[PDB]
Design an enzyme around this catalytic site. Structure first.
Site, mmCIF file in Angstrom:
data_model
loop_
_atom_site.group_PDB
_atom_site.id
_atom_site.type_symbol
_atom_site.label_atom_id
_atom_site.label_comp_id
_atom_site.label_asym_id
_atom_site.label_seq_id
_atom_site.Cartn_x
_atom_site.Cartn_y
_atom_site.Cartn_z
ATOM 1 N N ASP A 23 -24.043 -23.621 46.509
ATOM 2 C CA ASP A 23 -23.213 -23.635 45.304
ATOM 3 C C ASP A 23 -24.074 -23.269 44.090
ATOM 4 O OD1 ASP A 23 -21.448 -24.109 43.233
ATOM 5 O OD2 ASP A 23 -21.357 -26.265 43.504
ATOM 6 N N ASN A 73 -22.400 -22.733 40.716
ATOM 7 C CA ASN A 73 -21.718 -23.128 39.481
ATOM 8 C C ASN A 73 -21.356 -24.615 39.463
ATOM 9 O OD1 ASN A 73 -19.332 -23.388 41.043
ATOM 10 N ND2 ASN A 73 -18.844 -21.227 40.704
ATOM 11 N N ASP A 100 -19.288 -26.469 41.293
ATOM 12 C CA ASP A 100 -17.919 -26.912 41.460
ATOM 13 C C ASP A 100 -17.855 -27.590 42.834
ATOM 14 O OD1 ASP A 100 -18.228 -24.721 43.091
ATOM 15 O OD2 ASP A 100 -16.314 -23.778 42.569
ATOM 16 N N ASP A 149 -20.810 -20.433 47.127
ATOM 17 C CA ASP A 149 -20.315 -19.157 46.612
ATOM 18 C C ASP A 149 -21.236 -17.970 46.952
ATOM 19 O OD1 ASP A 149 -21.207 -20.952 43.821
ATOM 20 O OD2 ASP A 149 -22.390 -19.206 44.407
ATOM 21 N N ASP A 186 -11.921 -11.485 64.358
ATOM 22 C CA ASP A 186 -11.414 -12.798 64.735
ATOM 23 C C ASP A 186 -10.264 -12.706 65.739
ATOM 24 O OD1 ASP A 186 -9.190 -15.034 63.832
ATOM 25 O OD2 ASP A 186 -11.227 -15.886 63.828
ATOM 26 N N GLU A 196 -14.407 -11.481 68.821
ATOM 27 C CA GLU A 196 -14.315 -12.840 69.344
ATOM 28 C C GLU A 196 -13.178 -12.822 70.353
ATOM 29 O OE1 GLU A 196 -12.050 -15.813 67.199
ATOM 30 O OE2 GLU A 196 -13.447 -17.392 67.784
#
Length: 556
Positions: free
Chosen positions: A21, A23, A25, A29, A199, A253
């Site tokens: 992280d 920022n 929050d 990110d 996926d 996958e």
């Protein structure tokens, strides 16, 4: 031999939300990833696969996409993304993104319109059927609990969702969906992404007529969904249309695809996917009926699955090797022993194996440190919708007690691998200065990147060395795989042979010492590496292995 960068590379998987992280929050990110590229380069990483980074309601943390071309607000902006590709390229690292096109979010423009009317242009972008009676169309189960059919009050019909309700499946039969999807792919490829991880690629094509499932098929429903009659037709088209027109390493996958059917997805000759993610190994100890239940396994079982995979891959295909990821429990907890006395040793043992397989290794974020499962206090400490879904189907139904259920999901839940990365021993393990979005493991005071970077015997530095060995010894990448004793339940031993360069890998899976006797005609000429800091050079005919001891040797 058919060389290839993606065959020799070492991939690192990042689950953004839980990497770093910037920022405060409390959510990982993209700038966090950028910030740690030097860490990953030093580790020896060649390519990075990031889980979904697109606009999403986050009902399934990114796998429910509401806009394929927009960056998830939680992760940053386009500028941040572009900057990641640029910074990675600068360090000779390739970026592989997660492609989720078996379905979209129920908040995706295509579904919003498809949902508005039975004659809307986008109506045929998904699957809508009538429940012949006072129930759903058929008896299809959902991976996340209950029925795979959701009733739409307005229209009156049911829409299909193999996964979450908020994850309606796209209709690949409709040539319009395919084209919009291919357009979306080139959007990203045009920006520089060097790889794509697809996926659940085996479920793109649905079964015509949506026939019901027999009592048998009900159980292995995961496998039936891969029985689509147009799967390789579609994937081949995507190859012709897109994949084959860019330099992109592709990984599929194939959850649910039996081993004897994987070849069709990665066979060079078929022009489909470069390598696949099989689940025969990572799920070897999962009950057949109750996907959440853990059962005992043995080394012989383990190694035998690996031999079979190698044989199936043969000369024309290619595989990946991974012992954990965002949908599974931590590698050391699952395959090693995460208790304080054995964590490091068993972690290093598993590392030895991971980087000396005839497959492209994928290291999941934090396992290079020996991160472990999380100590879930009670049921509500899980976010895993798969778990909440299991609770409804097995605990509400009384098929299993809440206690036994908890004992098991504690060992199998994907949340085990979703707790924030442990950078140092400052508050929140240096992950954030805000409130972490998901509970951080208290063992961060012991298990953290910083602490391990300076300690020569740390799991991190052992991984650095193993990766370095893989980058310098071709045989470890392309050499033939040979299990010296498929029936041994104590010591995993195998050779990697490329011409006359033979290497022996040995792993004591037991927690007591063991003497391993090499084949009579084999002699150890050199010690490439081993997990013991002290341990001097052994002699040619045998090895006295300490608990969880591992080693790589060059034979004559």
């Amino acid at each position: 031999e058919y060389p290839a960068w993606w065959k020799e590379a070492v991939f690192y998987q990042i689950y953004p939300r839980s990497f770093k992280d910037t920022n405060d929050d409390g959510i990982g990110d993209i700038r966090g990833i950028i910030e740690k590229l030097d860490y990953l380069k030093s580790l020896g990483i060649d390519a990075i696969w990031i889980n979904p980074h697109y606009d999403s309601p986050n009902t399934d943390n990114g796998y429910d996409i509401s806009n394929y071309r927009q960056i998830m607000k939680e992760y940053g902006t386009m500028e941040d993304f572009d900057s990641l590709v640029a910074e990675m390229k600068k360090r000779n690292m390739r970026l592989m993104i997660d492609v989720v096109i078996n379905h979209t979010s129920d908040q995706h423009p295509w579904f919003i319109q498809s949902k508005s009317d039975k004659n809307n242009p986008y109506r045929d972008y998904y699957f809508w059927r009538d429940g012949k009676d006072n129930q759903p169309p058929n008896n299809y189960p959902s991976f996340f609990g209950g029925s795979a059919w959701q009733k739409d009050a307005k229209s009156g019909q049911y829409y299909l969702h193999y996964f979450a309700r908020q994850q309606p499946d796209l209709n690949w039969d409709n040539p319009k969906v395919r084209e919009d999807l291919y357009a979306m792919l080139r959007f990203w490829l045009d920006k520089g992404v060097s790889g794509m991880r697809f996926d659940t690629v085996a479920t793109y094509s649905k079964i015509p007529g949506f026939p019901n499932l027999t009592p048998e098929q009900q159980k292995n429903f995961a496998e039936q969904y891969t029985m689509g009659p147009n799967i390789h037709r579609y994937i081949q088209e995507m190859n012709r249309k897109v994949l084959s027109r860019y330099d992109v390493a592709t990984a599929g996958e194939i959850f649910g695809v039996p081993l004897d059917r994987s070849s069709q997805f990665f066979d060079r000759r078929r022009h489909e996917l470069n390598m696949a993610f099989m689940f025969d190994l990572i799920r070897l100890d999962r009950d057949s009926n109750e996907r959440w239940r853990h059962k005992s396994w043995s080394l012989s079982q383990f190694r035998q699955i690996i031999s079979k995979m190698d044989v199936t891959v043969g000369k024309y295909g290619w595989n990946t090797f991974f012992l954990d990821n965002h949908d599974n429990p931590r590698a050391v907890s699952h395959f090693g022993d995460d208790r304080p006395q054995w964590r490091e040793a068993s972690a290093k043992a598993l590392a030895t194996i991971t980087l000396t397989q005839r497959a492209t290794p994928f290291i999941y974020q934090g396992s290079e440190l020996g991160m472990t499962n999380y100590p879930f206090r009670q049921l509500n400490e899980f976010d895993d919708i798969e778990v909440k879904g299991f609770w409804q189907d097995y605990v509400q139904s009384g098929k299993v007690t809440a206690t036994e259920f908890l004992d098991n999901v504690r060992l199998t839940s994907r949340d085990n691998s979703r707790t924030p990365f442990q950078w140092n021993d400052t508050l929140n393990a240096g992950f954030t200065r805000g409130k972490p979005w998901f509970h951080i493991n208290p063992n961060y005071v012991e298990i953290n990147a910083e602490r391990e970077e300076t300690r020569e015997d740390s799991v991190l530095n052992y991984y650095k060395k193993m990766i370095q060995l893989r980058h310098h010894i071709p045989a470890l990448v392309y050499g033939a795989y040979q299990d010296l004793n498929p029936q041994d339940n104590t010591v995993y031993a195998y050779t990697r042979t490329l011409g006359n360069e033979r290497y022996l890998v040995v792993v004591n899976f037991k927690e007591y010492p063991v003497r391993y006797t090499l084949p009579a005609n084999d002699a150890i000429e050199e010690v490439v590496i081993d997990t013991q800091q002290q341990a001097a050079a052994p002699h040619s005919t045998s090895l006295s292995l300490s608990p969880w001891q591992a080693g790589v040797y060059k034979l004559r």
